[PDB]
């Protein structure tokens with residue numbers, strides 16, 4: 228269908244068996260939905276909202292136009308519907324494999340939620356992940372600057388950080404090593420560990436050799452005006468002046484609904500097809516091993532949708548021109 | 552972030568770029584913005600009137616449906632904004648000196664200058680061009696090629712769904728896409744243009760499927776306002792079709808790569824898009840894999856990052872000395 232699913236259609240759609248069900252309606256999931264809808268296959272996209280792409284203010288490196296994250300989802304959503312994809316505003320809880328097909332439970336609505344289950348021969352895991360954010364009592368203070376000039380991905384915003392006073396909020400001793408990659412863009416790095424883990428002397432000597440100050444105080448407030456951060460204030464009232472920052476605190480994986488198996492080294496392993504260890508499920512974008520960009524996520528959906536279309540097509544009966 | 556004119560040839564020819572990108576299409580432009588955004592020196596060289604330029608509607612590239620011209624125009628602007636250099640020229644030849652590449656470019660169509668630029672890395676992103684049916688009045692083919700007379704099944708299969716379709720095959724082997732196109736529409740008419748003999752094996756297979764086989768040459772494509780509605784053959788007869796698919800092969804834009812060596816139909820690459828020849832990457836339509844804009848853009852991201860990682864890891868750490 229070419230319409231969003233509301234309360235009435237659950238009885239119909241639960242009986243109906245989709246060719247593929249897409250979990251997550253972001254960059255990769257929408258691309259896959261558009262391709263699958265364009266291949267005349269039954270596809271349902273399930274999007275919870277407020278995803279990682281939604282908080283992206285400026286998509287800098289996705290040709291041909293610079294768009295916001297909300298514009299990206301809105302345009303791709305519109306496109307998927309236009310081509311015949313079904314879209315549902317819900318959260319995917321779990322999946323059951325019966326040998327053939329998948330059974331996908333979805334929490335509909337935040338409170339007093341319906342738990343409709345949908346059927347599909349294939350599944351596409353395209354739920355991405357969410358970046359960890361420093362924790363303050365007023366998170367609106369963190370939100371005012373996060374995603375603007377307080378960055379979460381080095382490749383996405385490194386260009387705008389060039390030769391600027393930068394603060395690296397590292398969530399672990401390993402995460403401090405991003406200073407030695409961030410320094411490519413700016414050597415004016417201040418490493419902030421938030422008083423969370425003790426730093427080894429090896430790394431302490433390395434930061435000193437490079438001249439990067441190490442501040443192990445907790446954070447209290449981000450200082451800025453009109454979404455442009457200009458400083459960081461610590462618990463004791465003191466502060467530092469920074470023109471930009473990079474959060475390197477790890478990522479949260481939206482892989483609850485995923486089954487077991489599925490080999491990984493922190494992220495699911497996939498073939499050039501984006502086919503995971505399970506033959507019938509494909510992993511897209513940030514969930515799979517590889518770059519975490521919109522370009523590669525969009526391409527992943529193209530790869531997965533085509534591999535699925537080839538398998539179904541090669542198993543379908545030829546459509547002949549029968550007598551009229 | 553400037554476009555090269557007459558003055559800048561001598562200066563930029565002396566400069567060693569970090570990478571040169573051959574072809575300013577989907578994949579090349581994506582690689583350009585990433586490299587420029589890695590604060591690396593990159594030069595893009597675009598001839599113009601490429602395959603993507605003739606694409607009228609980009610259907611399956613989120614978030615917006617744009618024309619191929621809009622795609623190149625936007626990506627070009629972006630690359631320039633971020634510091635990439637753009638040259639309007641044709642890449643003629645490439646030499647690997649062991650420590651760098653020298654790329655000669657024909658500048659201007661007539662009375663042309665032949666500046667040769669330098670770079671440590673090279674990205675081959677010149678794609679290919681689809682073969683078209685040959686009529687005396689080629690404007691009649693261009694009138695409909697790219698609108699509803701298609702060249703790529705994956706791109707426009709959706710618009711061909713359950714419509715009277717003509718498959719213009721350039722060879723008996725090419726006729727086999729009818730058995731893939733039938734997924735979208737079974738109302739397929741196979742046209743051989745009377746250029747090659749069809750075997751009875753294939754002749755019987757088309758009959759079993761009910762796909763008419765017409766072995767007459769073509770004379771004119773019938774339509775009005777870029778929407779084809781039929782085909783007229785040499786003998787005066789005609790058929791009515793609402794759409795068609797051209798399957799006559801492709802010519803590669805890989806002339807300048809003759810000197811280099813590049814395992815091959817298409818160039819083979821790793822996941823990085825790295826070719827066999829060290830320090831050169833092949834993107835998009837030149838490499839083995841799907842021929843789509845989405846995967847071409849992603850190819851540029853992979854190559855640009857792989858180059859950045861190699862240089863970054865080879866550069867001295869930038870320490871804070873104040």
Ligand SMILES: Cc1cc2nc3c(=O)[nH]c(=O)nc-3n(C[C@H](O)[C@H](O)[C@H](O)COP(=O)(O)OP(=O)(O)OC[C@H]3O[C@@H](n4cnc5c(N)ncnc54)[C@H](O)[C@@H]3O)c2cc1C
Nearest residue numbers: 251253254255275278280287319354355512513519520521
């Ligand atoms: C501030 C910021 C700026 C960025 N800038 C750039 C940039 O310039 N260039 C770039 O390439 N990348 C950028 N990124 C990262 C980029 O957004 C991701 O790499 C990209 O979106 C990955 O796409 P995806 O489809 O894998 O995941 P997403 O785009 O996050 O899509 C996942 C979607 O699935 C939904 N979802 C998740 N779990 C579930 C569930 N269980 N049920 C239902 N729905 C679910 C989410 O709501 C989300 O919308 C940026 C990120 C941030 C935070």
Ligand SMILES: Cc1cc2nc3c(=O)[nH]c(=O)nc-3n(C[C@H](O)[C@H](O)[C@H](O)COP(=O)(O)OP(=O)(O)OC[C@H]3O[C@@H](n4cnc5c(N)ncnc54)[C@H](O)[C@@H]3O)c2cc1C
Nearest residue numbers: 275276282316317318334335336337357358360370373374
């Ligand atoms: C750069 C950046 C900027 C950000 N800015 C903001 C901001 O300004 N404001 C903000 O609030 N957050 C922001 N975030 C995200 C923030 O950090 C938290 O991740 C978010 O606020 C918490 O989401 P949630 O409570 O919906 O958790 P979720 O994991 O989305 O929800 C938890 C549970 O709720 C249920 N559920 C979720 N969605 C649905 C649905 N559609 N239907 C039914 N059930 C559902 C599921 O069962 C799930 O287990 C930002 C993140 C980044 C990286």
Ligand SMILES: Cc1cc2nc3c(=O)[nH]c(=O)nc-3n(C[C@H](O)[C@H](O)[C@H](O)COP(=O)(O)OP(=O)(O)OC[C@H]3O[C@@H](n4cnc5c(N)ncnc54)[C@H](O)[C@@H]3O)c2cc1C
Nearest residue numbers: 574576577578598601603642677678804835836842843844
């Ligand atoms: C009518 C039509 C419709 C299409 N629709 C779709 C679609 O809906 N979706 C989709 O995914 N794909 C579509 N395609 C295919 C799509 O255009 C390609 O897959 C995509 O553009 C690949 O880009 P590329 O960078 O590999 O090559 P391109 O971007 O096509 O071209 C590379 C560039 O290099 C330049 N170049 C070549 N040789 C030289 C040289 N010697 N010197 C200088 N410059 C050179 C060319 O001029 C060109 O601009 C369509 C193609 C056509 C013809």
Ligand SMILES: Cc1cc2nc3c(=O)[nH]c(=O)nc-3n(C[C@H](O)[C@H](O)[C@H](O)COP(=O)(O)OP(=O)(O)OC[C@H]3O[C@@H](n4cnc5c(N)ncnc54)[C@H](O)[C@@H]3O)c2cc1C
Nearest residue numbers: 597598599605639640641657658659660681683693696697
């Ligand atoms: C769907 C579709 C629709 C098409 N529609 C059209 C159409 O409407 N009109 C049309 O003309 N073609 C169209 N084409 C392509 C067409 O078939 C021919 O490829 C093209 O028209 C002529 O190419 P060319 O002879 O210039 O070859 P090219 O290789 O482009 O040119 C050959 C020579 O010109 C020189 N040269 C080219 N560009 C430059 C430059 N910027 N600077 C210096 N020297 C240069 C080079 O030195 C080269 O040796 C279409 C193709 C497809 C697939």
